[PDB]
Design a protein around this nucleic acid. Structure first.
Length: 88
DNA sequence: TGCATCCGTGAGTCGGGTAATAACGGCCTGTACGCGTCCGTTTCCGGCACCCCAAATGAACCGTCCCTGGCTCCAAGGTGAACTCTGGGCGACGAGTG
């Protein structure tokens, strides 16, 4: 319990409440299970049916689950400049 | 007292973005939102106290901008001649014509 709560609290750069972290992980787990079962990636409608929640909420959770990227990571093929040099 | 062992220095210029795992009830509340009722506001129909206001309704009105009277006082129209081309008619004479 302590490890999972701390993971949900401090895992991501943008804090996500545990109530949303739990559903994010559940959606991902059963999505991978459905992909394994079917042989093809489950569709958003199928994922919504499995969640017993609306596809709009499924898509909102999916876009919420995204994580930020480093502004200082090398963007070129070699090491020449960072992503922070390409943002206005 | 060297000696290897890091240890840290430095080494040129104008295609983009890629991912895990067991986690799951159950209860509290905090702020935003929704429901029902109630009341000051303001917004619009109507009336005289009258405030009158006015183009529209009666004059003159008289100077001026229209008529009539007639009187002229002059230049256009009508009247001659003769005359100087303008022209018609006429006579003379010949050399190609018969």
């Amino acid at each position: 319990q302590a490890i999972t709560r701390a993971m949900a609290d401090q895992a991501r750069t943008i804090r996500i409440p545990v109530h949303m972290v739990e559903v994010i992980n559940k959606l991902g787990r059963i999505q991978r299970e459905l992909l394994q079962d079917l042989g093809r990636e489950p569709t958003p409608e199928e994922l919504a049916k499995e969640m017993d929640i609306t596809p709009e909420k499924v898509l909102e959770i999916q876009q919420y689950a995204r994580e930020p990227i480093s502004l200082d990571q090398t963007i070129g093929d070699e090491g020449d400049s960072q992503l922070g040099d390409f943002i206005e």
